Nucleic acid binder design. Sequence first.
RNA 1: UGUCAAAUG
Length: 356
Amino acid sequence: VTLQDVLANDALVEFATDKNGCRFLQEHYPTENDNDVHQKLFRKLVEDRAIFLSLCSNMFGNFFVQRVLECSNTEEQEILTEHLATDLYNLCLDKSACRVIQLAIQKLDVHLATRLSLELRDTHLVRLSIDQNGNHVIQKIVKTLPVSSWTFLVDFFADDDNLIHVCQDKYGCRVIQSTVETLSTDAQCYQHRVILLRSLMAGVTRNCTQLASNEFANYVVQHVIKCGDALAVYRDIIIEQCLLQNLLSMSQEKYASHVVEVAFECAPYRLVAEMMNEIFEGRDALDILLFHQYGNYVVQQMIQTCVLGQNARDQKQSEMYGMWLEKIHGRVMRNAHRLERFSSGKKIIEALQSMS
RNA sequence: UGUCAAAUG
């Protein structure tokens, strides 16, 4: 069995759609673009546009299309880009063909991959971003191509309704986070990515209460708070304008209590002190959270924040961390008999008894 | 005691 038999029998489809036949095609396809067998196999692949797209959508044929993409030059890439463009939206939703698309974003010349990226603008961008296959195509574009090739995505997610529908989705929350990560990492003299990030993050902070409460978008809100210097201004905006004056309610929520936790873990001192003051100065708020099924984890993070903050340098901050830790220690010791009956109050006591 | 956390042979 040779490749010359495959060409003479006109049996590219039969080999490519078979598991062992495609592996034979992958291993023996000549890599050089001026090889005669290479050109004859490439012609058989792209002569019939419908045959090519069916091979892209085939469980085994897509691996051969990917191999052709790896060895492709600019002339071959021009033909492949034209074929993929005619059915690009459905190829991004297909289980096999989205892997052809994802490799094409990496492998094609940037102006060819930019053509495929920009073609998605007039399609259904929410349906792409939430598809089990399509969300990987969007993230591949964002992580690989220059921002000029996908700036329409930033404009699209600047609408609050688009952002909420995508960010609350199981897969779309990854799409929002990958866009945020790419725009927030660098530096740039004129800060074009900074301005683009500000447009995207404005929707995040406007709808942060709904997003922190959501089963999937709470991960995105946590990422902004936990990120560090890249998203530090947006972390502080989220804490000041959403979390403050709502800490008692959010610490009692199934998903938003995780947001309150990472805020206590990562806020600057000036915001930690406002958060501590809200809990302590309004059965008070600390008593509610100590016995709460979600709020007890917030108290445990409040304890760990004060334990680490005692070893700070400011020494006026370090006094306040000890003052807050002792105030938690006083309230736990008063209610220790009731707290010991459950694992939540036991873990709080075990954290306090490691020191005293 | 707390989270549905990403698609091919």
